[PDB]
Amino acid sequence: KKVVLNINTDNMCNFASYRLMPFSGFIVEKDDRIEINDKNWFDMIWNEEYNKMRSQHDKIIENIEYLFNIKILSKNRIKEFWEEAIKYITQVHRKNPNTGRRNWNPPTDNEIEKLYETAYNTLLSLIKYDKNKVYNILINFNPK
Amino acid sequence: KVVLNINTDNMCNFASYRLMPFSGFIVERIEINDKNWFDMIWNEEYNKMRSQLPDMSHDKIIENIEYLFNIKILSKNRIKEFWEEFCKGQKAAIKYITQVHRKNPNTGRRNWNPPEGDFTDNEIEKLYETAYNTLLSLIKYDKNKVYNILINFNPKL
Amino acid sequence: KITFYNNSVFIETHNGNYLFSDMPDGNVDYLILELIDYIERLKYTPYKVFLKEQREILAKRIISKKIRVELPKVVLNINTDNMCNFASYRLMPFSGFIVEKDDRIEINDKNWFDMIWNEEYNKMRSQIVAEDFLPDMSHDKIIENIEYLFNIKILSKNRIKEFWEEFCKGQKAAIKYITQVHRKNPNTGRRNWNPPEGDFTDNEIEKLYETAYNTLLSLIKYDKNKVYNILINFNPK
Amino acid sequence: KRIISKKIRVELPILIEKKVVLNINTDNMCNFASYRLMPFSGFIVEKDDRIEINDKNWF
Amino acid sequence: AKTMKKIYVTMKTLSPLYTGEVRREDKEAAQKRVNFPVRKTATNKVLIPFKGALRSALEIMLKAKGENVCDTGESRARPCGRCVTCSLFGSMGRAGRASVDFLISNDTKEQIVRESTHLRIERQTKSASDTFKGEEVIEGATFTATITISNPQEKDLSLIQSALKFIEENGIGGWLNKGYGRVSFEVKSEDVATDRFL
Amino acid sequence: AKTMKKIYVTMKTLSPLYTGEVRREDKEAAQKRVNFPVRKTATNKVLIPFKGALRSALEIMLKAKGENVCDTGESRARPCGRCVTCSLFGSMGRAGRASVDFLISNDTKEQIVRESTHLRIERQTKSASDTFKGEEVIEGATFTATITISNPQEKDLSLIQSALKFIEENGIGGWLNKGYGRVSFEVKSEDVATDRFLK
Amino acid sequence: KTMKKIYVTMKTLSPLYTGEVRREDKEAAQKRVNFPVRKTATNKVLIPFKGALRSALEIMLKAKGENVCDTGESRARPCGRCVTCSLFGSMGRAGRASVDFLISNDTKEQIVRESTHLRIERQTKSASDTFKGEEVIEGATFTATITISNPQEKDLSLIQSALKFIEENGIGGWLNKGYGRVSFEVKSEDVATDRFL
RNA sequence: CACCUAAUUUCGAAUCCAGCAUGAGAAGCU
Numbered sequence A: 001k002k003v004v005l006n007i008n009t010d011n012m013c014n015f016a017s018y019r020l021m022p023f024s025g026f027i028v029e030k031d032d033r034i035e036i037n038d039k040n041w042f043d044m045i046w047n048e049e050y051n052k053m054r055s056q057h058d059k060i061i062e063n064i065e066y067l068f069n070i071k072i073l074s075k076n077r078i079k080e081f082w083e084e085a086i087k088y089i090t091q092v093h094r095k096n097p098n099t100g101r102r103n104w105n106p107p108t109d110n111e112i113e114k115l116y117e118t119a120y121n122t123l124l125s126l127i128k129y130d131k132n133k134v135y136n137i138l139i140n141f142n143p144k
Numbered sequence B: 001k002v003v004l005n006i007n008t009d010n011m012c013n014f015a016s017y018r019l020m021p022f023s024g025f026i027v028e029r030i031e032i033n034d035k036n037w038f039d040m041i042w043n044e045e046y047n048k049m050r051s052q053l054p055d056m057s058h059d060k061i062i063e064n065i066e067y068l069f070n071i072k073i074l075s076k077n078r079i080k081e082f083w084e085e086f087c088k089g090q091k092a093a094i095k096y097i098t099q100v101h102r103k104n105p106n107t108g109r110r111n112w113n114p115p116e117g118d119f120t121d122n123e124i125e126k127l128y129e130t131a132y133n134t135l136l137s138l139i140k141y142d143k144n145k146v147y148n149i150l151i152n153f154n155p156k157l
Numbered sequence C: 001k002i003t004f005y006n007n008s009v010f011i012e013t014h015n016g017n018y019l020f021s022d023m024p025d026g027n028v029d030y031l032i033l034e035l036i037d038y039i040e041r042l043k044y045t046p047y048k049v050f051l052k053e054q055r056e057i058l059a060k061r062i063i064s065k066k067i068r069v070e071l072p073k074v075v076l077n078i079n080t081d082n083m084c085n086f087a088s089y090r091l092m093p094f095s096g097f098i099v100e101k102d103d104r105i106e107i108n109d110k111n112w113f114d115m116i117w118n119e120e121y122n123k124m125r126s127q128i129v130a131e132d133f134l135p136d137m138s139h140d141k142i143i144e145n146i147e148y149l150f151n152i153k154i155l156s157k158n159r160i161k162e163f164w165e166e167f168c169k170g171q172k173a174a175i176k177y178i179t180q181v182h183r184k185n186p187n188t189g190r191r192n193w194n195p196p197e198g199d200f201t202d203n204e205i206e207k208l209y210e211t212a213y214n215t216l217l218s219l220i221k222y223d224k225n226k227v228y229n230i231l232i233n234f235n236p237k
Numbered sequence D: 001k002r003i004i005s006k007k008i009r010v011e012l013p014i015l016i017e018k019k020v021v022l023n024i025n026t027d028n029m030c031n032f033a034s035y036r037l038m039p040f041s042g043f044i045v046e047k048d049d050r051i052e053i054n055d056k057n058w059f
Numbered sequence E: 001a002k003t004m005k006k007i008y009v010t011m012k013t014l015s016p017l018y019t020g021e022v023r024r025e026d027k028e029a030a031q032k033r034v035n036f037p038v039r040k041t042a043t044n045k046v047l048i049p050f051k052g053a054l055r056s057a058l059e060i061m062l063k064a065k066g067e068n069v070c071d072t073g074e075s076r077a078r079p080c081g082r083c084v085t086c087s088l089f090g091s092m093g094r095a096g097r098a099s100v101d102f103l104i105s106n107d108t109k110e111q112i113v114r115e116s117t118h119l120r121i122e123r124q125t126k127s128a129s130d131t132f133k134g135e136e137v138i139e140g141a142t143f144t145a146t147i148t149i150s151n152p153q154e155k156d157l158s159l160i161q162s163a164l165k166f167i168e169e170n171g172i173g174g175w176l177n178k179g180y181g182r183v184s185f186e187v188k189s190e191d192v193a194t195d196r197f198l
Numbered sequence F: 001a002k003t004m005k006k007i008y009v010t011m012k013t014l015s016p017l018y019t020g021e022v023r024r025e026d027k028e029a030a031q032k033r034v035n036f037p038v039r040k041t042a043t044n045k046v047l048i049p050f051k052g053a054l055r056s057a058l059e060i061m062l063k064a065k066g067e068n069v070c071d072t073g074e075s076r077a078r079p080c081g082r083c084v085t086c087s088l089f090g091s092m093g094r095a096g097r098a099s100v101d102f103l104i105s106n107d108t109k110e111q112i113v114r115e116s117t118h119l120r121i122e123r124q125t126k127s128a129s130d131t132f133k134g135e136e137v138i139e140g141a142t143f144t145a146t147i148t149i150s151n152p153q154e155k156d157l158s159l160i161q162s163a164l165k166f167i168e169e170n171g172i173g174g175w176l177n178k179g180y181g182r183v184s185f186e187v188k189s190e191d192v193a194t195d196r197f198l199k
Numbered sequence G: 001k002t003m004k005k006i007y008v009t010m011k012t013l014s015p016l017y018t019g020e021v022r023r024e025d026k027e028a029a030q031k032r033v034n035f036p037v038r039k040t041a042t043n044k045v046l047i048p049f050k051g052a053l054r055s056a057l058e059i060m061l062k063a064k065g066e067n068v069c070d071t072g073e074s075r076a077r078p079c080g081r082c083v084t085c086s087l088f089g090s091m092g093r094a095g096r097a098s099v100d101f102l103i104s105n106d107t108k109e110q111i112v113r114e115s116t117h118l119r120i121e122r123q124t125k126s127a128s129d130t131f132k133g134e135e136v137i138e139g140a141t142f143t144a145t146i147t148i149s150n151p152q153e154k155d156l157s158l159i160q161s162a163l164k165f166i167e168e169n170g171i172g173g174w175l176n177k178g179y180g181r182v183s184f185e186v187k188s189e190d191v192a193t194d195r196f197l
Numbered sequence H: 001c002a003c004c005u006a007a008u009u010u011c012g013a014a015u016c017c018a019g020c021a022u023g024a025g026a027a028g029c030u
């Protein structure tokens, strides 16, 4: 079969009048058309096959004032809550069983866990409140 | 033009493409060709500047290496060291296998690992000769075939 | 310090005493050029003179006068000795390799390239493996077995991650991975499993390894959507 | 006094740089294993103060 | 603003040096052979993170001396912007004055990096229960770095040199408790103006 | 915190010391001459692992005493983090406060390193059935290590010294059954400040 | 736990010879002597002790009818189940009985001498060959300590039986010529492992 | 009281193992 180099020949050496080059490419049979392509090629198709396998109320506002005052319920939190939300809030409060690392912000340790719980409560309740009410509530706290 | 100058065997099937990992030399009538060209060219010009095997079947090779691996005549240190001398050429592998197999005239002790079991003297020497003939005939094969043969017995070759 | 003489520059540095060509009185470490008398009249005979072909014949005279004569990235040698003497030239019949780094250029032999070719061969071989890209239990039993081996840390998040990567590469690659992981070593007696936490003996530990083997074997027969919904609960990434 | 009369310097208790000259066209270079190597064919000439590497045309 | 401080750091290893590979692709390529690869360049030279070691040295020393110095070591800890290491190394708003370079080795991986065998031995039967291969940088291998301080102060160099002697005392890189990473630093400082290039 | 303990140990060798070479390329360079190379630096000085010996000594004695100590010697065993040796030598969530340096010889190679011959003899025949060559460290060679305890306690120096006497009793590394590695220790400790470098 | 300490004190009854093993200490000494005695760098005499105990115990336990592995054959593998496998180690475990070297109490200038041995023709009774060897003098005292990690009720008895077999056969080299006959004294004690705390 | 000798040979290899575990986040300016 006809054989085509996809490799770059624009780097060479001259030894014994032979224009040689050490190379580490892969030879591919493709339907009576053989080719020898580089490592990048295999990187690209390994990525393509991986992506193909990958194709499958006043107290609430006062709690937000306290929490944003010590910045545990900060601006990106308010944004990503707006971007949303129950599964999000579940995913940003769940304590890691190995390290005990809740994904909130740092603000005693008992007060820290109470404040963390306070956030989960306030975050869950505000999603209970309808849109616009929370939206307005959240604008003067983080305008975005 | 392309002349591949390599065996197009050992073709695995990643995804829907029959690939085959390779490392060789492109030489310009362009001709991709393997490490044997570099051995030939290196010997040729290195001496031009100095001017002032047994053949046993592949199934029987695999079965005998499996048998000697179970009774610990061939071990992971031996399969790795023989692979290192096989990468150094087909003449260093002959020297290494001859050095391991040889009976020292004063002691009579071959450098193989002794078998594990209840084998008598003639059976032990027959298995030593089996290891010699098997690793001697294995060299007659190419690097990829040698690699697929010994990669089962030693997974970190 | 730069003095003068009859055209002579006499630049003194901290390293060496150059003289570009009356003669001076100090040491003229490097001299740059009847002149033999100009050499012989000059105190502290120079180390190495810096001298169209008549030059070379003159240099032979400078060679005979017992004076060194030169006729007009750091490079290191990783070579041998061998040596030879042909046509008044100490030689070496060697062919090799010029390796270019950021600061050094080194001259290496073919043995270093064989070292590099062995490494590149061993690198290439461990990229393409087999056909990249069974028992059976119920789905809920698979859930409680993965929960139980997660609690006792036999099946960990890293093991679930490599299981998902070997499952995306296909069925046979994942079969090879679990048969490698559950491989009891005949000369050592350990498998490639995380040992469970808890007060256990050898029999229930071996049984738990067997149910880990059977659970990860029976999960392979399921499709990718069920396996993804089975393993996100334990490994969220 | 008698080696000063021989016009050679005497101490009573400079820089010399032994340099390696390449003298080889290194513009034709290739990359194989993150190494800029070139297959090389020449002679290690060892004269004084200069271990010059010289090609086959020099020979 | 008219002057800058140039601190050329030449560090040699008295103990074998390990720092861990960070690139995932390089690390998953390396575990087919070795279990703990050393962090290297794509030009095969060894790289060590350096700003974190100097900053951690200054935080521990300045906290133990008694200055009002914040701690950025804790989880998601915020730099205050008032202490001297907030001014020297970085703040949440103001950038760091010291642009600390990486520790670039002089030699490549074939000269200074060597793969070795580490163990885990049972205490009762005295047998090697586990075994793993890890790369390390050899002893006497030298590394170069450059610390460029813009808007310098009088005491910045004393702080950097004190942090360097603390890194000699503790170690740099990983596996510091087992004896790895003990180093010796040479310092060449200099005043420059910013318009040498002009 | 404000202070750290410095424990300079100077260990002299009484019976020949072997600690095996770890580097695979240094091994493969040295197996053409010596079957058992000694652990060595690139600056031709002898390296000995020290943290594992002290840790294993403390776990063995504190287990025989009956104290709550985990074992980190079984296969893939993880430290709990509540022991006494877990504080000194580390756990999964916390590092060890006692950073233990490698034992590095004051002399170099080719001065304390000596390559020797070892035997295996038939019991019925009394002939040298096997022979190998191993690289040892001579007796009277002096090694220097430092232990930096970051958060010192009252019982750290006593625990370190007790582990040192156990290393004297058992041996430090290598073929400890045959009699190799029997050493003795000299200890000099001081409570240095953490801010001593801040001039 | 407990540990067993057997302090052995060895008095040398006939001459003793253990050859040097270090290459740099033999090839630097072949211009002076032909068989240098095995030494420390602190000028004290070294004798390998674990192998003599192991060889003794394997001979007597093999001839008693119990299953023991023979580690005397070339490239032998210990079984891991026998008594000497438990005491002196095997492949996969280690020796409970760590056996120290036999360190001399004196230097070499006190208890090492340099003898002249011959080889004599049989027909004519003439000194055909001459060689020189360093030997350890008689009554030289050596000391060693056997430390048993997990002791049983039959480790000290087997160690003492191996010591008596060593006094009957000999330790070190040149055993058939009469060299190396010794006398052993044992001080046995049972320490606690946590005793250094 | 002398005198001769003080050398020579074999071996210098073999094997096991090379695994796990954790964490993938958040801030300000904007």
Ligand SMILES: [Zn+2]
Binding pocket: E069, E070, E071, E079, E080, E081, E082, E083, E085, E086
């Ligand atoms: Zn701060």
Ligand SMILES: [Zn+2]
Binding pocket: F069, F070, F071, F079, F080, F081, F082, F083, F086
């Ligand atoms: Zn613990």
Ligand SMILES: [Zn+2]
Binding pocket: G068, G069, G070, G078, G079, G080, G081, G082, G083, G084, G085, G090
């Ligand atoms: Zn046995």
